[PDB]
Enzyme design. Structure first.
Site, mmCIF file in Angstrom:
data_model
loop_
_atom_site.group_PDB
_atom_site.id
_atom_site.type_symbol
_atom_site.label_atom_id
_atom_site.label_comp_id
_atom_site.label_asym_id
_atom_site.label_seq_id
_atom_site.Cartn_x
_atom_site.Cartn_y
_atom_site.Cartn_z
ATOM 1 C CG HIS A 153 43.838 46.673 37.506
ATOM 2 N ND1 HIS A 153 43.805 45.479 37.944
ATOM 3 C CD2 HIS A 153 42.692 46.820 36.792
ATOM 4 C CE1 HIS A 153 42.796 44.854 37.512
ATOM 5 N NE2 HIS A 153 42.236 45.732 36.772
ATOM 6 C CG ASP A 197 35.106 48.648 36.592
ATOM 7 O OD1 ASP A 197 35.491 48.021 35.259
ATOM 8 O OD2 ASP A 197 35.640 48.033 37.450
HETATM 9 C C1 HEM Z 1 37.414 44.337 42.118
HETATM 10 C C2 HEM Z 1 38.507 44.311 41.299
HETATM 11 C C3 HEM Z 1 38.591 44.949 40.234
HETATM 12 C C4 HEM Z 1 38.561 46.388 39.987
HETATM 13 C C5 HEM Z 1 37.997 47.325 40.935
HETATM 14 C C6 HEM Z 1 38.960 46.513 38.567
HETATM 15 C C7 HEM Z 1 39.100 47.954 38.146
HETATM 16 C C8 HEM Z 1 39.454 47.963 36.892
HETATM 17 C C9 HEM Z 1 39.752 49.464 36.407
HETATM 18 C C10 HEM Z 1 39.164 50.815 37.028
HETATM 19 C C11 HEM Z 1 39.996 49.336 34.924
HETATM 20 C C12 HEM Z 1 40.126 50.471 33.866
HETATM 21 C C13 HEM Z 1 38.955 50.896 32.981
HETATM 22 C C14 HEM Z 1 38.565 49.873 32.241
HETATM 23 O O1 HEM Z 1 39.404 49.750 30.895
HETATM 24 O O2 HEM Z 1 37.659 49.072 32.634
HETATM 25 C C15 HEM Z 1 40.236 47.902 34.905
HETATM 26 C C16 HEM Z 1 40.323 47.488 33.712
HETATM 27 C C17 HEM Z 1 40.779 45.984 33.495
HETATM 28 N N1 HEM Z 1 40.686 45.103 34.339
HETATM 29 FE FE1 HEM Z 1 40.033 45.354 36.217
HETATM 30 N N2 HEM Z 1 39.454 45.406 38.209
HETATM 31 C C18 HEM Z 1 39.221 44.618 38.863
HETATM 32 C C19 HEM Z 1 39.627 43.146 38.758
HETATM 33 C C20 HEM Z 1 40.121 42.446 37.537
HETATM 34 C C21 HEM Z 1 40.196 41.345 37.448
HETATM 35 C C22 HEM Z 1 40.148 40.193 38.465
HETATM 36 C C23 HEM Z 1 40.735 41.109 35.890
HETATM 37 C C24 HEM Z 1 41.278 39.946 34.969
HETATM 38 C C25 HEM Z 1 41.815 38.854 35.785
HETATM 39 C C26 HEM Z 1 40.590 42.374 35.423
HETATM 40 C C27 HEM Z 1 40.916 42.697 34.324
HETATM 41 C C28 HEM Z 1 40.984 44.088 33.758
HETATM 42 C C29 HEM Z 1 41.196 44.102 32.349
HETATM 43 C C30 HEM Z 1 41.486 43.185 31.282
HETATM 44 C C31 HEM Z 1 41.121 45.706 31.851
HETATM 45 C C32 HEM Z 1 41.330 46.190 30.662
HETATM 46 C C33 HEM Z 1 42.841 46.484 30.376
HETATM 47 C C34 HEM Z 1 42.874 47.313 29.213
HETATM 48 O O3 HEM Z 1 42.924 46.622 28.105
HETATM 49 O O4 HEM Z 1 42.907 48.506 29.068
HETATM 50 N N3 HEM Z 1 40.145 43.226 36.435
HETATM 51 N N4 HEM Z 1 39.890 47.154 35.788
#
Ligand code: HEM
Ligand code: HEM
Lengths: 370, 370
Positions: free
Chosen positions: A278, A183
């Protein structure tokens, strides 16, 4: 070689163009707090509080004791990358005769269909983010800030979190969350041409020059459900491998840095990165350029009577405008994200975090002096 | 020069004469958890549980994943000094037909006049102590141990704790607590002549051979009152200086290890170390030889609706017999200790922690086999 003592000796700048705790590296310990101004505290009381807090923050971030008789809790330690960051809620402006200076950016977040918000544990007039790599350094700072508030403001809500420590891994690498995912791989970062446009209010309301808007979400992970899934099911929810964070579109020599292939299909014609994954649907290039810096802490606060863990992510994101960051992405995720099934948004806050203090100044001085 | 990677790479031994987590150095992150056996769980189900738990502990303490269904939360981190320790409460023996094997040492602690115990967050059939210097490593172990309980046991209570991180100080130093005191100076250590006698059951019932008795106390610190005291007042409560932990009887050259002079008076004939000072009245030489190893974590769980911090010390002490350790000292502290005014004992547990698992064994095997 990085010596062990660097954990304590590392020191973050208080003074700067931007406040600390935005681009600062991840810290092992976090305390988030919201305060509400006391009845009868207006502009003048609020300005005095921000001066007290800024004087305290400046001292503590340099590893020095508090201005008034320090508790000695952090004594012996170095600064330990302590940062203290201050924000203002929508409600602050109506308490202090500053309605005309309330940014449009603080308009209430949507009532998303998947919200389960405890409103008492949400929002607030003032927000403080404390982080450090040492828990005594962090607690000492929380306590000093909270004691500086005195009768001028009460603690509305306060949450504790944690992350991986420096040195836990053989070399520095992207953190994990309590779902076991890598993450933090894809974030806007300093040095990208569009980083400032995405994250910070520019210099040309004027008091927010060089500031950012934070959205905080207390997101419980439904680990009881999540942890019964197959690896394939869990990886399909994100679109990336648990082993190293590589996209599912990569082969065996793919790594965390391998670019995602959103068109790749398997032998049956089915997308390898699922359509509702996601890490597909959150990308800026899937949201008209909507973008944010993510800088979270994990949490765990016990088990209920049925053994359900109160654990998850203190999601903390930074953007120049929530309407070009958190809001449109979360509108999409609300029902559209495969991940939504496995998480619960249980508290929320949106705060305006101004530019960093210059020498001799307090944080929010331009607002409160006007 | 000790490298930063030592935080993650250091590894505690699981197999041995004694269980880990007794003489092991202090760890930055702690989780204490108590379990009650479920309906339908008797001796044979408890024996199977300790087998599972011991195998989980063995793997995880070596920096390995769980044997199956690993969550990846600790992945890439080294062992980070993880330890897992197991105990049995008084109530366990009547649930398993093992009354004849219940040690006299588990007889209930006194109801001290100063007790304010939460019955629901006290005692329990089974206790597990988890500690490590990385929070993801620690959480991953808590979750794995808790998930091993399955249908055999439910979480009765669970507490989080913390201490100073490795590398926070410029060189290794005695810990501090949230009152800002040096805490741990006079802790018995292996290598002192009476150590084994004080702390471990000798090579009681035979199943406890090489074991120890733990008393856990959740002691809230009344920080709102404590932090309104002068330095002089605070130092008189303990009998040692906050700056360096020296006895108040010591000169400017004295340090924490300088021997306390219990007879020294000032120019008016008054004792320099007060008669009711905590670090006077807790000494083995003031309690007919009663002694214990102390190996705590600090805690902070947030603030109540009125602004009072739920913060303090998870006091965890180790002795061969509570009646020659915790019990007589606490009888003396109850009303006699200057410190008592500033603390509140709010939960308690007394557990029998048997010897360590040999290679090819599980913890508690001499008790539970049948
Ligand atoms: C517990 C809640 C969440 C979990 C477990 C989670 C997990 C992850 C994981 C594993 C990734 C991929 C690795 C990375 O690039 O960081 C990711 C990417 C991302 N998440 Fe989340 N996420 C959560 C909530 C959110 C929320 C609420 C938002 C926005 C409203 C969000 C926005 C993003 C964005 C913008 C990326 C990067 C996408 C990219 O440009 O590749 N996430 N998330
Ligand atoms: C939050 C509660 C408590 C605090 C803040 C506290 C603090 C301290 C401090 C600052 C010292 C001196 C430094 C050292 O040698 O470790 C100390 C020593 C000690 N305390 Fe406590 N203490 C607490 C509770 C207890 C309890 C409940 C017991 C036992 C029933 C206990 C037994 C001891 C003993 C045996 C020593 C060492 C005395 C000696 O031989 O020099 N303490 N304590």
């Amino acid at each position: 070689a990085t010596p062990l003592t660097s954990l304590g000796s590392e020191q973050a700048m208080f003074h700067g163009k931007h406040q600390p705790g935005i681009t600062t590296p991840m810290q092992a310990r976090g305390h988030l707090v919201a305060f509400d101004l006391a009845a009868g505290a207006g502009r003048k009381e609020a300005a005095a509080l921000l001066r007290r807090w800024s004087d305290t923050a400046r001292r503590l971030m340099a590893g020095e004791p508090a201005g008034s008789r320090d508790t000695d809790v952090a004594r012996d330690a170095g600064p330990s990358s302590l940062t203290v960051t201050f924000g203002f809620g929508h409600s602050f402006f109506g308490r202090t005769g500053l309605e005309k200076q309330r940014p449009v950016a603080l308009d209430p977040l949507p009532d998303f269909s998947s919200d389960h918000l405890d409103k008492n544990r949400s929002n607030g007039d003032l927000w403080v983010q404390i982080g450090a790599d040492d828990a005594l350094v962090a607690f000492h700072a929380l306590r000093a800030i909270q004691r500086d508030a005195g009768a001028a403001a009460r603690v509305r809500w306060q949450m504790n979190g944690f992350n991986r420590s420096p040195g836990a891994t053989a070399h520095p690498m992207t953190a994990r969350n309590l779902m076991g995912q890598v993450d933090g791989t894809r974030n806007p970062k300093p040095g990208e041409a569009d980083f400032d446009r995405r994250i910070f209010v520019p210099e040309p309301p004027a008091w927010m020059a060089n500031g950012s808007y934070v959205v905080v979400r207390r997101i419980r992970m439904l680990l009881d459900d999540w942890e019964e899934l197959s690896l394939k099911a869990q990886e399909d929810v994100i679109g990336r491998r648990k082993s190293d964070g590589a996209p599912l579109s990569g082969g065996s020599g793919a790594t965390e840095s391998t670019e995602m292939d959103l068109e790749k299909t398997d032998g049956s014609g089915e997308l390898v990165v699922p359509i509702n994954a996601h890490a597909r649907i959150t990308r800026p290039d899937q949201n008209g350029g909507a973008a944010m810096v993510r800088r979270p802490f994990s949490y765990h606060d016990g088990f209920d009577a049925d053994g359900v863990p109160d654990a998850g992510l203190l999601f903390v994101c930074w953007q120049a405008d929530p309407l070009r960051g958190f809001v449109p992405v979360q509108r999409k995720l609300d029902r559209g994200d495969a991940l939504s099934q496995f998480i619960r948004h249980e508290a929320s806050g949106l705060f305006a975090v101004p530019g960093g203090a210059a020498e001799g100044e307090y944080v929010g001085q331009r607002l409160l002096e006007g």
